[PDB]
Amino acid sequence: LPEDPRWELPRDRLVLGKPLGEGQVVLAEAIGLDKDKPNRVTKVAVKMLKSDATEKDLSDLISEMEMMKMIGKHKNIINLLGACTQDGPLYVIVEYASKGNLREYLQARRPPSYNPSHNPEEQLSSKDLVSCAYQVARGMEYLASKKCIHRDLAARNVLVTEDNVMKIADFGLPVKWMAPEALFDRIYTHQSDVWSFGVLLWEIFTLGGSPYPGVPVEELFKLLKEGHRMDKPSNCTNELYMMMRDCWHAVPSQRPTFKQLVEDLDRIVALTSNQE
Numbered sequence: 466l467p468e469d470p471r472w473e474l475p476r477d478r479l480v481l482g483k484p485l486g487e488g489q490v491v492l493a494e495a496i497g498l499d500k501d502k503p504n505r506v507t508k509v510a511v512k513m514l515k516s517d518a519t520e521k522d523l524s525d526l527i528s529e530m531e532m533m534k535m536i537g538k539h540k541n542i543i544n545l546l547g548a549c550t551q552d553g554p555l556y557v558i559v560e561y562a563s564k565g566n567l568r569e570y571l572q573a574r575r576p577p578s579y580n581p582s583h584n585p586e587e588q589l590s591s592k593d594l595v596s597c598a599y600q601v602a603r604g605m606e607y608l609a610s611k612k613c614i615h616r617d618l619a620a621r622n623v624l625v626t627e628d629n630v631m632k633i634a635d636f637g638l639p640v641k642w643m644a645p646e647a648l649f650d651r652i653y654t655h656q657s658d659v660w661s662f663g664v665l666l667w668e669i670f671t672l673g674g675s676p677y678p679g680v681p682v683e684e685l686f687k688l689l690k691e692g693h694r695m696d697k698p699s700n701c702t703n704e705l706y707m708m709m710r711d712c713w714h715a716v717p718s719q720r721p722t723f724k725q726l727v728e729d730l731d732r733i734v735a736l737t738s739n740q741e
């Protein structure tokens with residue numbers, strides 16, 4: 466594989482740590498990732514091919530990496546940090562998110578709807594929830610501006626850092642998150658991503674609720690054509706419900722853009738107190 470000096474990090478500068486999940490992702494420590502601070506260690510996530518991996522697996526991993534190079538940096542996406550491509554197997558180094566995906570993060574913060582965790586965490590304010598939504602919309606607005614269409618936007622594909630920064634995941638590569646047009650015609654656009662975001666908003670305000678609970682997949686597209694839409698979560702403002710519903714406009718052209726959603730969420734965040 467051709468070397469790329471803009472991203473290469475010597476292999477011995479990376480201390481492989483524990484599994485993070487399934488190629489596969491391990492936690493690691495990078496020594497001197499910032500060339501200005503060569504004695505600093507930074508926790509990172511690393512992706513590499515699985516044990517019984519194919520040629521297709523390899524070139525997808527490369528495509529993902531090359532795509533990540535082009536998209537550029539934004540604080541609300543999982544950014545590329547480097548790669549080990551030479552002295553052995555391919556490693557792709559990206560930012561680490563210690564607090565899990567948003568779906569788990571939220572569930573684990575439910576009041577003791579059911580809390581599956583034996584290790585529960587502290588309650589989130591109303592302002593925190595809106596601000597989570599705002600950050601995710603910022604992520605997507607940036608991705609949309611670089612002409613990237615996600616296709617599987619959902620709370621499970623948002624990750625949360627140690628500092629509670631929301632970061633879009635796997636943006637360079639389930640039916641209950643798809644716009645109808647994607648579901649039927651396999652037509653994915655920025656507008657279908659906006660649909661997916663509405664579902665993601667509903668997850669936020671159900672603290673990780675499963676969408677369309679009890680509805681079988683088979684039925685769902687029909688129900689959707691007939692104008693079926695999820696009910697408002699028990700604890701969600703009418704305003705934020707309207708945003709969900711706008712995201713779920715049957716006509717893709719009539720949905721708001723991520724640009725507009727960011728603006729709207731910015732206003733709502735500033736209008737929601739830390740105490741309400």
Ligand SMILES: COc1cc(OC)c(Cl)c(N2Cc3cnc(NC4CCCCC4)nc3N([C@H]3CCN(C(=O)/C=C/CN(C)C)C3)C2=O)c1Cl
Nearest residue numbers: 485486490510512543557559560561562565566634635636
């Ligand atoms: C090219 O490499 C990547 C490209 C990416 O998007 C463009 C992403 Cl999102 C990733 N990441 C980076 C990443 C960063 N931090 C974490 N933290 C874990 C969160 C899950 C709990 C422990 C820490 N994970 C990353 N992973 C995956 C690894 C597993 N992930 C999950 O959400 C797993 C959920 C399963 N539950 C039951 C624990 C996210 C990734 O796949 C990686 Cl490694």
